[PDB]
């Protein structure tokens, strides 16, 4: 996917920010953004295709493909980007409207946007992060067992690159922790 | 698809806009072209190489899907997206032609002219919701039961990663419900 | 395809052209270079893949889609748009020549261009219109019947996605006559 | 494939040269590279996977398709483009080279370089023109009987999408003769 | 995958860098990411596709690609790029903090930032090297025997293009202790 | 591949470089990145997948095209490319150190680093020739009999277009070759 538009206004955020949101922008780019388009997406490439179940019944494999994977988790990842990305816009958005007004005529209203922009920040991570742990957990096994109709029985099936995949989910997964810990830390520092 | 050319003319419009414009800017960048270009285009690349029927007869997956899937849910969104910006373009157009009878030399004409904006965005937005509610609701079962020739009978067809589909009809569906939430506001918000 | 190129040429015609010119370039990027870049050349990428025709018999299906399409439509809108733009092209032109003639040392020869450029693409828009109507009317119907050697007798050949092709047919033809609409406004204009 | 570094140099060389100069650059950009880039890359994308021989012997498709298409098409136009713009890279260099000469410090020299810039542009056009001619002609048929090793006997083999490849080679003459055209009337124009 | 936006960063770094700082990037740039996106990443893309096991067994070629690549090398070289990367975007972050603080208002607390920087590049890179050359050592053999349940008894299984990939590994490896001697090398200049 | 990066430091040394060195980096750009980028990489890219081999025995085309493309054509030319050009970096690195030193406070050590440029230029070209033909000669035949276990006996194996590979396997010698020219006559303009 192409992320530009989304870049510059992340930039033009970074201007008007801390240092430690400036660190947490940095994060997003070079561990989010650049590790999906370079890595991620390619591991989750032959996701459906590679995907393989024991049977000679039509429409096993889509259905247990679909139960298996309601989401992909490379598009669980760009929501959560998009969210957690959409709280920096708020922020930036109230920045220039006073800027403009101030053109027409951190601390204050400024202030309590910020706080705000931290808190939502905070929130969707923990929800995506909790999310997928109830979806999936952190470890896709190579077998799935599926029993959805029209399958007869239960079908077993295999998962591609499960293991890179696990490795990508865990990596993924710290790096947002590592976010949770930047914005707590930058509520500490703006308060004390 | 490639939206460089048409980002920049937004981009304009936002220039010459209210605050709530440029927050259906915002939206209309990050949640709806960010979204189809980042994640919704994969989920449906698949759509009918792995579509699926149960049967010998050559041609009956082809009309199968045609009739399943008169238009594809990317191509309706792309329509929409073009549809509810050409009316913003309408306005910077008008306000760029002011600029240069003053050169040669919001309230008034342009007023009239952005409330018009405004209706047409909100018309059409409607429209297509309207649109894809009775082409599909806002669900794809897997099973599609198709009796077009030359199918013999009724056939099972299987539909690819439906899950996944639904859980994108709905957050384009909230997304636009959003916007139509945003132009309501401005109408308020300029009127009183 | 990449249309970088064509974009900056015809911009700069904009800044020298009429308000209806800016509206019909507008037009031709939105909804006719936009639309295929995101829209239709996805739909007519399986053209020949998914095209599948009922018989043992090898090289039947090549030289039975040959016939059904002899050019895609796709290709015929690329040059339908290429060559709708070279008159404005050839006006763009002429006005960089008189310029740089200035430096060295509308109306009047640059009026009569313009019209040329008018008649030239209400000419080439008239005939892409026809050549596309009689190679395939606006209506691609799902069953071709096909009796080209090799093919023994009369075959059964099957179309695929044609519900969207033919949506997509319509739509560019509509904003053909749009385009058409254009230019007679424009004649109108600037002879009264 | 990505002719950005072609087209700088390109342009560079439009603002040191004559009107018709000017044209000629016009119509390499809009009539063989954006046609290349956006049409005749996908016609010929499917060259070798949809070329079907009848017979089951290992190997014959491969030496078959190798006899019919010893180049493909366009890359044959790829090298024609390059080397028909190589003499304005010439010139354009010998340009810059007295520019940087005053610096330190069109008739004459220059003159001269842009002669044989235009002769080289003439014979190059000619001679591929007469290699496309001997190689294929101007018309791909859509049967190719085949006799090379390992192939028994004679084999029938079909090639893909026969009458849209032949339009398009006809447009490439076309476009090459036009380009003929302009150079010849350029050197009147110089001359006399 | 694009890498634009890193490339920005680094960039900034390089102007405010040892001239070993700039051989290290420019290394970084034109022997890792370029050779990746010109080279490795199409070496590696038909992995599991082409991977064969001799059996007919349902999912055992699935689960031995797993097993004999639980990582793919293009990733973890993209991995060991992003992590000899980020010291200096947290040197260039340091920098720019401190000249952002003079304008409110290499040597001392710098230094030993660049030290730090210096330290980590080198420790991820003998880390990754390490880690490389436990997973797979630095030679890809043809042959893979897996005995991993699906798969009955020990089958054997083919990997793809396995002296080309052996070949980039080593070169890979080279690039990376070339960048180690220029991190001790720098070391040794700053010191004495 | 993305040459972007390697393409500005390139045109950065154009600057402060001969004119024959502005010949030769012409001929890189032009004769070497654009023929991969835009015909090459097309011509190779179903080296494996359209590779065949006369028998029912798993691995053996692995195997075979493995022994047959250690490495690939494109990757060769690739690296040719890079370190033909590494050189021209060390000597922009030197003259941008020499500049920064001015501002702090071609003849001499420049010369010299030119010309240490111009031999590691020449003999890189040299190395990467011979080294192509003793890999393949300048001609791909299209039988390859191969006799790696675990193929039985010698099996027959088909490459996919081999005469368009020699035309471009010769193309790129006679460029190379070019280049080596052009070195010469650089080496007797500085000297003489
Ligand atoms: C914008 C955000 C979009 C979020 C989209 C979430 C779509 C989830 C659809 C689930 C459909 C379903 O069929 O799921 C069934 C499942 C109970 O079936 P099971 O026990 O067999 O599943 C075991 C796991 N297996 C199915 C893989 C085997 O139910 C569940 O897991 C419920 C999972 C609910 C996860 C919700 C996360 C929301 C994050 C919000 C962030 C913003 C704040
Ligand atoms: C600052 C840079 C930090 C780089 C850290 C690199 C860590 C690499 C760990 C590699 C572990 C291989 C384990 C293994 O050989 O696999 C066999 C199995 O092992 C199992 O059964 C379960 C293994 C579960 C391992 C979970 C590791 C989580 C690591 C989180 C680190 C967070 C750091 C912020
Ligand atoms: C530019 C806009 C382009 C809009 C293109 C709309 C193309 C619609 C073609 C429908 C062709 C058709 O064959 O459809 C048949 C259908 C009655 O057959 P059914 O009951 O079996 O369908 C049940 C659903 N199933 C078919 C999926 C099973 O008829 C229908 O649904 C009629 C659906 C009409 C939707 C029109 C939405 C227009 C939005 C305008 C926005 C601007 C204002
Ligand atoms: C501001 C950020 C908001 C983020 C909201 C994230 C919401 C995630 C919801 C996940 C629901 C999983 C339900 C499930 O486990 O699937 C099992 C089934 O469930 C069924 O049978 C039918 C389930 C139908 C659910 C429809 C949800 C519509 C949500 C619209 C929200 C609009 C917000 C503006
Ligand atoms: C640059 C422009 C390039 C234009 C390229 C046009 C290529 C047309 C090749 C047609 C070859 C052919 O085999 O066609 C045969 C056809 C008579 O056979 P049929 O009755 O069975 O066709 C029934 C339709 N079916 C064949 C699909 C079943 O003849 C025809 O349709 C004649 C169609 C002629 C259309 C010409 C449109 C020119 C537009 C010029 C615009 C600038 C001014
Ligand atoms: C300014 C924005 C305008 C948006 C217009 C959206 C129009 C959507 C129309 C959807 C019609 C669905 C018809 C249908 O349910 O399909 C079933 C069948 O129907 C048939 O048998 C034959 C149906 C033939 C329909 C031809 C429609 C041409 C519309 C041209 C409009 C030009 C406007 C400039
Ligand atoms: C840089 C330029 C690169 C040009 C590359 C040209 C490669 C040509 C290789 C031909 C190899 C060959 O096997 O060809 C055999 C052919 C005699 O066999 P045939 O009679 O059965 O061919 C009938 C046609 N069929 C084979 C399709 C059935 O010989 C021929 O056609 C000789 C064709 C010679 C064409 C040369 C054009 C050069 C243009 C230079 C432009 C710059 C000045
Ligand atoms: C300025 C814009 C000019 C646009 C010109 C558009 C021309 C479209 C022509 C369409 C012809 C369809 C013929 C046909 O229906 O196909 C059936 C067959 O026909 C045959 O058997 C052999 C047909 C051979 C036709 C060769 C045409 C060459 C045209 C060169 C024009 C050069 C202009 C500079
Ligand atoms: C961010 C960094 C991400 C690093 C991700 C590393 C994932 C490694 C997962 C290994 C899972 C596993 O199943 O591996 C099993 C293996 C013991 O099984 P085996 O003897 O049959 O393996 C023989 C080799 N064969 C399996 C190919 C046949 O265990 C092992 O190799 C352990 C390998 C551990 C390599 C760790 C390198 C970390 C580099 C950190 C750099 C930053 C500081
Ligand atoms: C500054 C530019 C340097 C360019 C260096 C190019 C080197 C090319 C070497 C080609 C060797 C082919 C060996 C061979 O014919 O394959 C047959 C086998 O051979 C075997 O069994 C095992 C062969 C193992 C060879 C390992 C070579 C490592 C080279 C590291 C060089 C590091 C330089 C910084
Ligand atoms: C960075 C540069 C990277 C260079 C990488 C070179 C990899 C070469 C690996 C060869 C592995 C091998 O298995 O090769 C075996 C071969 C003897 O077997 P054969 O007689 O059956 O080969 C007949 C030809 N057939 C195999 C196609 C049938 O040995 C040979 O050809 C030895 C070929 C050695 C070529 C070295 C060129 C280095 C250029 C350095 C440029 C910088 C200075
Ligand atoms: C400045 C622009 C120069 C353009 C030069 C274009 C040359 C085109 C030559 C086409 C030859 C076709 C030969 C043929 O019909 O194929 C049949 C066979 O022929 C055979 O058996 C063996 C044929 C081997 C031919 C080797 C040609 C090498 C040419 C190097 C030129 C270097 C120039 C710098």
Not at 33 to 47: F, N, P, Q, Y
Not at 147 to 169: A, G, H, L, M, Y
Request: charged share 15%.
């Amino acid at each position: 996917g192409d992320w530009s538009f989304l870049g510059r206004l992340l930039e033009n955020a970074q201007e008007h920010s801390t240092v430690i949101g400036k660190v947490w922008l940095t994060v997003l780019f070079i561990f989010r953004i650049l590790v999906l388009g370079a890595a991620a997406e390619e591991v989750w490439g032959d996701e459906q295709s590679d995907f393989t179940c024991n049977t000679q019944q039509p429409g096993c494999e889509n259905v247990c493909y679909d139960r298996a994977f309601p989401i992909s988790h490379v598009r669980f990842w760009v929501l959560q980007i998009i969210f957690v990305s959409t709280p920096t816009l708020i922020y930036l958005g109230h920045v220039l409207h006073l800027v403009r007004m101030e053109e027409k005529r951190i601390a204050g209203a400024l202030l309590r946007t910020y706080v705000f922009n931290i808190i939502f920040k905070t929130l969707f991570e923990v929800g995506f992060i909790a999310g997928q742990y109830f979806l999936y957990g952190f470890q896709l096994k190579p077998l799935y067992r599926c029993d959805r109709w029209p399958c007869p029985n239960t079908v077993d099936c295999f998962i591609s690159r499960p293991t890179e995949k696990t490795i990508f989910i865990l990596f993924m997964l710290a790096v947002a922790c590592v976010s949770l810990l930047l914005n707590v830390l930058e509520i500490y520092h703006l308060g004390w």
